Amino acid sequence: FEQKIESLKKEKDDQLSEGNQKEHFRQGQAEVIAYYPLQGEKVISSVRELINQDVKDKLESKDNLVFYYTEQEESGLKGVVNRNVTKQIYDIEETEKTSLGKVHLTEDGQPFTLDQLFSDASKAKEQLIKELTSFDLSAWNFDYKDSQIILYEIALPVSAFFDVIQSSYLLEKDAALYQSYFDKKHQKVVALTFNDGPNPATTPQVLETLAKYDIKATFFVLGKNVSGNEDLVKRIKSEGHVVGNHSWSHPILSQLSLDEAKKQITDTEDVLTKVLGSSSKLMRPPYGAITDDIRNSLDLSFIMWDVDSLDWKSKNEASILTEIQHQVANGSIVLMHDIHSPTVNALPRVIEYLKNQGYTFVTIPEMLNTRLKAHELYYSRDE
């Protein structure tokens, strides 16, 4: 027997002596041998700590011989390596656990934690919990592989967090994915959108101006305004613009019962399909007021905005232009109302400014294209 124990100890030294320092002790009835890894000539402190924690809490006082040791592996992130910890218990019966635990490390042996992966730890945790539920941050157990963050498991595409990722930690494949994401994010597109029409006294001039400047827009029209304006609605579509649904009569939809709010929307789908032959399946709630139940009841995408021109409030062409100059960003969806003269009058200067800054004007379907799904809310190209 004694010779058998000696052979186990000799085998482990033959396997593990190099690059490790060997600790030996008894705890209770257990004999323990731990191989702590060196980085250069120094014990990796956070690995020694993880082993010692297991010794305190989980090591049972049985007549056994217990070994701990580690192996270095790649982490899947640039400049980060992992130590996997194996625990083996001999009673000759034996049982081992590989990756009993794992620590992530800089190449020089210092702790790397999940929060360091992100430029914004607070937002990332928020994004992680969100994607997590759909399926301290530093203390989160994780792995990284095949372009996914693995939570302890739960595997989440890394692409979902590119908004808050520290991209310098990405290896080649992920860095090319991030580059593509960044280039798309910096594509200079804007969607002009107009609520509350058609209005026979102003919409025709808006159409003439959009045609002059060789751009398209998206018009969220009221069902009640379609009667008597059918040829105007057809003209909006004939000139290449997109027509969406702005309810029948402009109530606060979230303050109606579910079926009355749904019917405000489907009555408007009905009249638009009758006049145009088709629906874009885009719906913008009056006042931005909507509920989850209404959204989940209808096969439509709900289009909000991120830039309010304030045309409705300022009623002033110079103010409208200033708001556009200061607020418009890549991917913005701009709210205007094609029902009063300040907006009509301001439009040429707004378009000239944005084209002079290098923007492309897009329709909502052009902007959202792949992203558009039933029930969902959209505030901009990306949000």
Residue numbers at the binding site for Zn ion (CB under 5 A): 94, 96, 195-196, 286
Phi, psi of 13 (to 5 degrees): -65, -40
Ranges assigned E (strand) in the chain: 20-27, 30-39, 42-43, 65-74, 80-90, 94-106, 142-145, 148-151, 154-157, 189-195, 218-221, 242-245, 282-283, 301-303, 307-308, 332-337, 360-361, 377-378
Q: How far is CA 78 from CA 99, 108, 168, 199, in A?
A: 21, 13, 7, 58
Is 282 exposed, middle or buried, given 0-12, 13-18 or 19+ CB atoms closer than 10 A? buried
Q: Judged by CB, which is closer to Zn ion: 286, or 331?
A: 286
Instruction: Tell me the CB-side half-sphere exposure of residue 20, using CA atoms within 13 A.
Output: 24
Q: Judged by CB, which is closer to Zn ion: 34, or 253?
A: 253
Q: Which residues, at least 6 apart from 53, have a Cβ–Cβ distance to it below 8 Å?
A: none
Q: What is the smallest separation between the CB atom of 168 and Zn ion, expressed in angstroms?
A: 40
Q: Judged by CB, which is closer to Zn ion: 204, or 251?
A: 251
Q: What is the smallest separation between the CB atom of 54 and Zn ion, expressed in angstroms?
A: 18
Q: Judged by CB, which is closer to Zn ion: 112, or 219?
A: 219
**DSSP labels, 16-63:** H-TTEEEEEEEETTEEEEEEEEEETTEE-HHHHHHHHHHHHHT---SS
Q: What is the smallest separation between the CB atom of 271 and Zn ion, expressed in angstroms?
A: 16
Q: Judged by CB, which is closer to Zn ion: 45, or 98?
A: 98
Nearest-CB residue for Zn ion: 195
Could you tell me the sign of the dihedral formed by the alpha carbons of 33, 37, 38, 42, in that order?
A: negative
Q: Judged by CB, which is closer to Zn ion: 16, or 156?
A: 16
Token readout for 104 is 């992530």
Q: What is the smallest separation between the CB atom of 256 and Zn ion, expressed in angstroms?
A: 15
Determine how many CB atoms are found less than 10 A away from the CB of residue 40. 7
Q: Judged by CB, which is closer to Zn ion: 117, or 222?
A: 222
Q: Judged by CB, which is closer to Zn ion: 96, or 208?
A: 96
**CA-CA distance, 41 to 59, in Å (whole number)?**
28
Phi, psi of 156 (to 5 degrees): -125, 125
Q: What is the smallest separation between the CB atom of 94 and Zn ion, expressed in angstroms?
A: 5
Q: What is the smallest separation between the CB atom of 172 and Zn ion, expressed in angstroms?
A: 36
Q: Judged by CB, which is closer to Zn ion: 8, or 275?
A: 8
Is the preceding omega at residue 198 within 30 degrees of 0, hence cis? yes
Q: What is the smallest separation between the CB atom of 338 and Zn ion, expressed in angstroms?
A: 11
Q: What is the smallest separation between the CB atom of 195 and Zn ion, expressed in angstroms?
A: 4
Per DSSP, helices labelled H in 84-202 are 121-134, 172-185
**Contact by Cβ (8 Å): 47, 36:** yes
**CA-CA distance, 52 to 19, in Å (whole number)?**
19
Q: What is the smallest separation between the CB atom of 23 and Zn ion, expressed in angstroms?
A: 21
Q: What is the smallest separation between the CB atom of 16 and Zn ion, expressed in angstroms?
A: 15
Of the candidates 1, 3, 2, 378, the one whose C-alpha atom is nearest the C-alpha of residue 191 is: 378
Q: Judged by CB, which is closer to Zn ion: 195, or 380?
A: 195
